[PDB]
Design a protein around this ligand. Structure first.
Ligand SMILES: *[C@@]12=NC3=[C]C([C])=C([C])[C]=C3N([C][C]([O])[C]([O])[C]([O])[C]OP([O])([O])=O)C1=NC(=O)[N]C2=O
Length: 108
């Protein structure tokens, strides 16, 4: 099934995206110049459920995995439903270094 993939740097305080797959840029309409070095939340908009945004904010603080269903918006403003799974990548000393994300457009 079609999916996209990003990597966030958890050594920086606000988890900026440091790598994105070609499908991520193609699905959202943003280019690497507007994606790299930024937190993923720019994809959110009016109808994004803050209860689910909270679930990811908390899971990132606690360094746990998480899977939420988020209303996101393309660059041209049109919406799409984003099934998002965030996975923590730890160093051998237990510290979280990166977060990785699989995003599926589940608008069907
Ligand atoms: C975004 N994908 C995504 C991928 C990774 C690896 C991580 C760590 C986060 C996301 N987010 C969410 C965003 O970065 C942030 O974690 C949340 O908005 C909650 O934090 P705040 O401080 O804003 O309450 C993703 N958010 C999206 O909307 N779409 C994704 O694809």
């Amino acid at each position: 099934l079609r999916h996209t993939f990003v990597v966030a740097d958890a050594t920086l305080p606000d988890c900026p995206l440091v790598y994105a797959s070609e499908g991520f840029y193609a699905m959202t309409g943003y280019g690497p110049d507007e994606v790299l070095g930024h937190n993923c939340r720019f994809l959110q908009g009016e109808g994004t459920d803050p209860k689910e945004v909270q679930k990811i904010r908390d899971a990132i603080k606690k360094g746990e995995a998480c899977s939420v269903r988020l209303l996101n918006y393309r660059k041209d403003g049109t919406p799409f439903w984003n099934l998002l799974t965030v996975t923590p990548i730890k160093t051998p000393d237990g510290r979280v270094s990166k977060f990785v994300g699989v995003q599926v457009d589940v608008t069907s």
